[PDB]
């Protein structure tokens, strides 16, 4: 099914999510979105923020279709960082190391996650097929 491919792939980044990247020591820095209050000026330097639970929201909400689309919105998290914090900060240093171990992960699933890519979009080309083939019945 669609559903159960869509289910097994944003299970497998959540489970990246949770137990590689949320266990890398000291990455609470990019666990939840930057609260304003603690941070005023946060959202003035930074228009595209990221984190990994906003990562997991969009995980639950079936945002990811691909690797790639998972890991922009990854790397983005290390692209705030280097411009909030700089390239050599201990701030980006972590989250470089949060980037690595996603990176790593990947890899070793790899093969299922491609796998799964690739039948979600067969299925979704399919359905918008037959979704514009019915409209104009
Ligand atoms: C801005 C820094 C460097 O870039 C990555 C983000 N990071 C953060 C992130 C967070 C969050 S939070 C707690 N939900 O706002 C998400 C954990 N808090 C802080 C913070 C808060 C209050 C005083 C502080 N002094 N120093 C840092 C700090 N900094």
């Given at each position: 099914?669609?559903?159960?491919?869509?289910?097994?792939?944003?299970?497998?980044?959540?489970?990246?999510?949770?137990?590689?990247?949320?266990?890398?020591?000291?990455?609470?820095?990019?666990?939840?979105?930057?609260?304003?209050?603690?941070?005023?000026?946060?959202?003035?330097?930074?228009?595209?923020?990221?984190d990994?639970?906003?990562?997991?929201?969009?995980?639950?909400?079936?945002?990811?279709?691909?690797?790639?689309?998972?890991?922009?919105?990854?790397?983005?998290?290390?692209?705030?960082?280097?411009?909030?914090?700089?390239?050599?900060?201990?701030?980006?240093?972590?989250?470089?190391?949060?980037?690595?171990?996603?990176?790593?992960?990947?890899?070793?699933?790899?093969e299922?996650?491609?796998?799964?890519?690739?039948?979600?979009?067969?299925?979704?080309?399919?359905?918008?097929?037959?979704?514009?083939?019915?409209?104009?019945?």
């Amino acid at each position: 099914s669609m559903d159960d491919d869509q289910v097994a792939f944003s299970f497998i980044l959540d489970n990246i999510v949770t137990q590689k990247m949320m266990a890398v020591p000291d990455s609470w820095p990019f666990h939840h979105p930057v609260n304003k209050k603690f941070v005023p000026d946060y959202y003035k330097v930074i228009v595209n923020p990221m984190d990994l639970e906003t990562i997991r929201k969009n995980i639950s909400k079936h945002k990811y279709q691909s690797r790639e689309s998972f890991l922009d919105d990854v790397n983005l998290i290390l692209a705030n960082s280097v411009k909030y914090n700089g390239p050599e900060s201990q701030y980006t240093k972590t989250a470089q190391e949060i980037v690595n171990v996603c990176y790593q992960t990947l890899t070793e699933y790899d093969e299922h996650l491609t796998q799964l890519e690739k039948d979600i979009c067969t299925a979704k080309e399919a359905a918008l097929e037959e979704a514009e083939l019915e409209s104009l019945d």
